[PDB]
Paper text:
A distinguishing feature of the pathogenic NWMs is the ability to enter cells through human transferrin receptor 1 (hTfR1), a ubiquitously expressed protein that is involved in the cellular uptake of iron.
The Fab fragment of the mouse/human chimeric 128.1 IgG1 antibody, Fab ch128.1/IgG1, was obtained through proteolytic digestion with papain and the Fc domain removed with immobilized protein A. Crystals of the Fab ch128.1/IgG1 grown by vapor diffusion diffracted to a resolution of 2.6 Å. The structure contained Fab molecules in three distinct conformations within each asymmetric unit. All three conformations were nearly identical in their variable regions but differed at the linker with the constant region. The structure of Fab ch128.1/IgG1 shows amino acid residues 3–219 of the heavy chain that include the variable heavy chain and the CH1 constant domain, and residues 3–211 of the light chain that include the variable light chain and the κ constant region. While sTfR1 bound to immobilized MACV GP1-Fc, this interaction was not observed in the presence of the Fab ch128.1/IgG1. Based on this model and evidence for direct competition observed in bio-layer interferometry assays, we conclude that Fab ch128.1/IgG1 sterically hinders binding of the MACV GP1 to the apical domain of hTfR1 and thereby inhibits TfR1-mediated NWM entry into human cells. The TfR1 binding site for ch128.1/IgG1 partially overlaps with certain residues where H-Ft binds, specifically hTfR1 residues E343, K344, and N34814. The crystallographic structure of Fab ch128.1/IgG1 also allows for the rational optimization of its framework and CDRs.
Numbering used by the authors:
A (entry chain H1): 1 to 219
B (entry chain L1): 1 to 211
Write the structure that this text describes.
Amino acid sequence: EVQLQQSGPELVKPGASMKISCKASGYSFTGYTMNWVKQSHGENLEWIGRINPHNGGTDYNQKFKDKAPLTVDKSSNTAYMELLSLTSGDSAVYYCARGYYYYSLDYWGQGTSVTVSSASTKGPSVFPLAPSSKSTSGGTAALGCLVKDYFPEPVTVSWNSGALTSGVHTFPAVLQSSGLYSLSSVVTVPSSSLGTQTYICNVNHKPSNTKVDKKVEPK
Amino acid sequence: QIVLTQSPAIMSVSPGEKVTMTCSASSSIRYIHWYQQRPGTSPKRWIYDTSNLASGVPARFSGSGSGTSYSLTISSMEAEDAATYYCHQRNSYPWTFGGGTRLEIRRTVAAPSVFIFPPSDEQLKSGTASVVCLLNNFYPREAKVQWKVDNALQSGNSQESVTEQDSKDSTYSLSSTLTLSKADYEKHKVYACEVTHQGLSSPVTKSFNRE
């Protein structure tokens, strides 16, 4: 299968520069062009431009030509996008998109979330949402995890290392008045299994390398 | 500079219904292209060259259009079609996209299950207390959570967030977090979460006392 793997989330300072990578596999790297697309919550999808890995030739949205240099490394099937002199308007999700030179874009990378801010990163605190009987409504109980006061987005939350999935609700982060983010993950579970089965929520905030696995037990 | 307008910005649709979204260009193009995106995930190519179904796209999808007016139609809407659809043209530099059209599937009214969570002992050592009210699996989206400490109505004291529309049962869920200092948390006793929804005859209230 075609796979485009982008580099992880970034927190970057205003006026600095940064680089996103996109590693392609499952096809001949030189046969297709690599495109880059910006998605922000102020302009939505914008085509930045493309590069031909064979000769390094590029085509630019003139809005981004002096902003986003595009380079390639055939040795490793990797395309790069740089972002120079970053301002807050560059905070967005960036995608790489494969595309045959004459066709439209077909495959997209997973996306790289970039936040431009002078603030330093902060890892979350993970707190349990213990299932009581105020958390039971007819043989089914609700438990979860509260990850709080982190910056910037995003965070990954999984339950039991990816085993628990059905009944899981990971709510979108909310921006607190402190300027930090907070979200909650919850699982609905048969209360038959509370005294026996154990439930671990796995939290990973990569910008601060905060890895916390917390066990939520009732009381 | 080619601007692509999509007429139905947001639109609610019932299951099995036939719905058509439009994409109109500011100037003539030779092929429109369609991309589907679910919140959080990356766009996936849906229809290329105005009418060709991308690999994996179900046969119930189809696209038509000419010169400037183009359209996407699903024959009978399903639950897994609740998503955002973008049209795209690569006819002239710079390549552009549309504003997007979001489709949410209609469902029977459903009342939420309301849970309440006291602050953990781990957070109470931190100096702050967060109570969380959980509204699980309801429809439609409108829901009024309201916090009351000792039957005193709080205001500006909490923040809520809503999940995207599920595609299994297509219900929403809401998490509301009331936050107080450890000082004020021990200054009171009964914390309640009052819920108002279409599927509820009377407002439901979950609560607990400190202890």
